[PDB]
């Protein structure tokens, strides 16, 4: 069926390599998480591999994993 290369479907464009898209763009994004014991909320990179702490805690709350990073006992969002 008739696809136009100048206006590709975004869904089948997201499954391609970030560089061979029509207009190259990042794959990562930021997101908000909530401390399990503090009311407040902090903004965290999705592919972090460096220490990330609480405003209060002295325990690091992120685990680097070679791709998207995981977190210890916290509950997240997307903004």
């Amino acid at each position: 069926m008739n696809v136009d290369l100048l206006y590709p479907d975004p869904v089948e464009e997201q499954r391609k390599h970030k560089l061979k898209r029509l207009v190259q763009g990042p794959n990562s994004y930021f997101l908000e998480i909530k401390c399990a014991g503090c009311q407040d909320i902090v903004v965290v990179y999705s592919h972090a591999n460096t220490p990330v702490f609480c405003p209060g805690c002295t325990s690091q709350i992120s685990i680097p994993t070679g791709g998207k990073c995981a977190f210890t006992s916290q509950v997240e969002r997307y903004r």
Partner: protein, 152 residues
């Protein structure tokens, strides 16, 4: 990359956003991220790691979008840029490490091969920096003297 001194052919790299503007949640002004950059440089953090720390803790994707300059340029503006650029410094460090390993092991030919490759890369980059007026015209990499210049 991984292609000047091997048969690699890998393409792993980062691709930055098309739109060149602060973040929607960006509270920071240039004068207050320059503060964090300079505090991190005084502490001894190399310029490639400063960007990592600002990305991972302060939620800043690109420093250029929030200030208008680049990290090494801001360091240079506040007189806190290094004497030697970071990449040449790292290559000299690796050369010193391999030589110190070879002092105990004279039968390791693989390490001698890689030492040759590293030092060739060092000379080429030193020539680039020299003709660009980012280094004294008398700069020269010397294998014997390279261990004690790392302290300075």
């Amino acid at each position: 990359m991984g292609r000047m001194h091997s048969k690699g052919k890998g393409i792993s790299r980062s691709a930055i956003p098309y739109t060149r503007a602060p973040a929607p949640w960006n509270k920071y002004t240039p004068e207050d991220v320059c503060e964090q950059i300079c505090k991190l440089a005084k502490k001894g953090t190399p310029p490639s790691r400063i960007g990592l720390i600002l990305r991972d803790q302060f939620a800043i994707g690109q420093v250029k979008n929030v200030t208008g300059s680049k990290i090494v340029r801001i360091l240079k503006a506040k007189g806190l840029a290094p004497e030697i650029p970071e990449d040449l410094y790292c290559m000299i460090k690796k050369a010193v490490a391999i030589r110190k390993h070879l002092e105990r092991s004279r039968r390791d030919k693989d390490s001698k091969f890689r030492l040759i490759l590293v030092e060739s890369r060092i000379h080429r980059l030193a020539r680039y920096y020299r003709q660009a007026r980012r280094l004294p015209p008398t700069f020269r990499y010397k294998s014997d003297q390279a261990a004690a210049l790392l302290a300075t």
